[model samples]
Target: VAPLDLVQPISDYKIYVSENLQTLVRDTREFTNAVKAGDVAKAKKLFASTRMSYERIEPIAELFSDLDASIDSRADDHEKAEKDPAFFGFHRIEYGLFAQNSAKGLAPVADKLMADVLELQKRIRGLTFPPEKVVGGAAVLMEEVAATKISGEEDRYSHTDLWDFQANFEGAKKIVDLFRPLVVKDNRAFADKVDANFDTVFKTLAKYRTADGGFELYGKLSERDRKVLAGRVNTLAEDLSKMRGLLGLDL
Candidate 1:
């Protein structure tokens, strides 16, 4: 541990991003195929999990702002809310499969969603990740989970926000695992603190798991439940930020 590979974390993180990107693409194609075939039941069944892979590497996908917005933006993000023609992507398809309870009219949106997903993958293949963003992404993912998304807003149509939280947490956790040895060698106490908080975060999430290993829909959770998750995630998010300075990637 005395002479660790200092530059390896970022390289490892890039590979992690690429790995998840492939999963996102594969799942998107399947989800879109279900939609295009007018299989509302199949599309609905695939909805939450398909978005799951996308959320895991969201920090990387978000590098292309337009594509991210087009593919994952919620209805609230647009001017007219769900009425906005500009509101299209996962949530829009979610609106079709869940809210509308039919996938008959979603072929066009699903088609574009598939196209943009592939384009996002194309850009990722040739891109160089920003080290600051890559390292700092752990904090940002949990911060969003704590500050905004934990309110159960992002997946309001389907109420599958729990899947997104799990996905985002796993994304952050992978980065911590990749960088853990470095922090442990330098600051064992801080490393333990971060790991404990991660464990706590996992515990909070686990309480909601269904028999199928999926979470209970967010809308089904009580206010107390939401508060509990918010508290745990906020702690982890704050602790996760220190890695930026700890690794001298703060910028």
Candidate 2:
């Protein structure tokens, strides 16, 4: 059971997630409209920006596994990504907009994307947040980044994996930051460790920053650079895993 003291923190996080989802819904609606209007350029740009909001809270969103898959599934997630009727979502829309370079069949996919985000917004508001899940979910988010995202598997066509990675990392960091007060109260050393780990990961990611203050193309990253990234993210995942036990949040 969640401690009484954690009630307010959990509520605050729920509000944070709710506000993010609302913006996701709004942005996705615009994205869908762009596709429906056959404005390919606008739709492509909107896809990247719209997806950033989804990436920000993906760990929580993944709790709704079916919805998450439908909204964010990549091509490789399926057996026959090219031919499968089931393979449709943000990545699919991306494939249509960027790879296929046509908005011809994207209208329905955009509609589905908006519908899923609406469902996410509605259901997430009513969902309960167990205190353990706050840290546990944070760890899971980092773990996912280390396992898949760092490899540039996500956003394959658009080469926007860095954007997704940054959003995911920042989202996980926000959760850890939120738990800082309680962590410090319970175990000062562990809190310090978490802070240091966040810094390490942030500095590691900062190397890829462009003059425009955005990440560069994941494909253009050198082999050695990818290894450096993967190694640091691996360590960050390990650090995040320790938070649950340190904070007495492990089940």
Candidate 1 structure quality by residue, lDDT tens digits, 1-251: 32235468768887888888798889999999999999989888999888888888975666788999999999989899977888889999998888988886688899899999899888888887765676566677787888889778898888999889888888888888887888888798998888899899888888889899878988777888888888888887787777777876653
Worst 10 residues of 2 by lDDT: 1-10
RMSD of 1: 2.0
lDDT of each: 0.83, 0.80
Cα RMSDs of all predictions? Answer: 2.0, 1.7
Taking the tens digit of each residue's C-alpha lDDT, what string does model 2 give over 1-251? 24776777778888878878988988998988998999989988877778888898876888889899899998888998855777888888888888889898778888888888898888888899876776677777777887667678888888888888878888887777777777777688977876787788788778888989877778877878777777777766777778667656665
Return the TM-score for candidate 1, rounded to 2 decimals. Answer: 0.94
The TM-score between candidate 2 and the true structure equals 0.94
- Using Cα atoms with residue i matched to residue i, what is each candidate's TM-score against the true structure? 0.94, 0.94
Q: Going through the candidates in order, what is the number of backbone clashes in each?
A: 0, 0
